[PDB]
């Protein structure tokens, strides 16, 4: 069947859209070539719709069947419960899209009578009606990128397909607890969204080390959500429901599956019928968990069919990395082709074909890779990093255009040990926060697509807990890494690293002069900027942080919120 059908009605914006980065001295101090930075808008929505609309064929074999059997068996070991109204409401991001039924995220979080009463009626309706398709809205995401000189043109907007706020809260009640337990039970250490960056690093290094002769590859499915079939989605349901659950959860999950997850009508922001979906909904609670489980089953079966030897997989939704025992360079290329052929039969054909890789630094999982640097005592330290182009371009946008999501803060947290997050992002944003006098204000950001809230004044403690003390002291990064960072700065017309060090001395001094938590930030975050280094010691606040499952609770992304 076709992933989508369309009426001809346009995808429409909900608020005024801006395509270009403003010319502004503040953003200009981060990067000068403003014309290279763009934001996707509804203008490119029809192009994406064409891209994500195609026919799916799916043929399953004995390899697939066997994997699925193991997974349902693993799933049966899970016991999960419904979330209460209060628990599901508290998971709602403060700026989650408002309901058409006279309330918004604020009313949900505060448990207002109108919101709670509506949500109860939506739940009851799910239990009583397991058939009527539930309406969704389709929107074009507004996201910022830099032009790519090797891709030719600008990216088309991604599309998001989501149900009313009332339904989103019900999704949490029915399935949130499952997102916290099922992926781990089914694929164990292969579930990527349970890991902090330092933990992902540890996993990759260990998978690499355990092979006598490691070969790695990433598999890029062309538009994964669109490749997900109605049968895949019902299989997901059977996996969810293999868990031990109360009857009421079974009913709600079955109903959500038939009325929402397997498909349904799409409306534009003007309320016009826009099309009909028959693939994965991109904006539901189960998008990431569903993708992760379905990618895993198909990929694991594909490894077996293809003769991939001793596969170790890292799965993060549709993002897949496979590390295995090389069979020789010619054999590896043959086996990868076979893998692709099997994934294709299972209805997950490739975008760019996979390529055998024999150097871990060059393997990307979720756009990130493991690199190596030296700690304060000359010890080798591994850390996660990525090309900084998109982070810096978004940072520049965020400095001059209000956004409820501060990607710069999420990048500093996830990529704290990197030379680019330290020298560029920390330097730039601490200077801005001091000028605004808003150092202490909590800010929302995303990690793995879920929403979090922290104060920048708590960064040293958070960074130490997540990444260790050495994150404040790495030096002697690799030529690959330094070359990539310097290239990105040059491309964006940003000041080079040496100029950031000059700026950071003054930012550091300013932070220290304020005493308190600000001075802690100055001493810890910017110890790299001064010749005479302070000896940094463990922060008492770091051990007091509840972060052990900080990533797990985001469920791989969605309409999910947590505060620190």
Automatic annotation (TrEMBL):
Residues 214-332 form the RdRp catalytic domain. It is found in: Host cell membrane; Host cytoplasm, Host perinuclear region; Host endoplasmic reticulum membrane; Host lipid droplet. Signal peptide: none annotated. It comes from the Viruses. Homohexamer. Homoheptamer. Interacts with protease NS2. Interacts with NS3 serine protease; this interaction stabilizes the folding of NS3 serine protease. NS3-NS4A interaction is essential for NS3 activation and allows membrane anchorage of the latter. Interacts with non-structural protein 5A (via N-terminus). Part of the replication complex composed of NS2, NS3, NS4A, NS4B, NS5A and the RNA-directed RNA polymerase embedded in an ER-derived membranous web. Part of the viral assembly initiation complex composed of NS2, E1, E2, NS3, NS4A, NS5A and the mature core protein. Belongs to the hepacivirus polyprotein family. Cysteine protease required for the proteolytic auto-cleavage between the non-structural proteins NS2 and NS3. The N-terminus of NS3 is required for the function of NS2 protease (active region NS2-3). Promotes the initiation of viral particle assembly by mediating the interaction between structural and non-structural proteins. RNA-dependent RNA polymerase that performs primer-template recognition and RNA synthesis during viral replication. Initiates RNA transcription/replication at a flavin adenine dinucleotide (FAD), resulting in a 5'- FAD cap on viral RNAs. In this way, recognition of viral 5' RNA by host pattern recognition receptors can be bypassed, thereby evading activation of antiviral pathways. This is Genome polyprotein. It comes from Hepatitis C virus subtype 2a. The chain holds residues 2443 to 3006 of 3033 of the full protein.
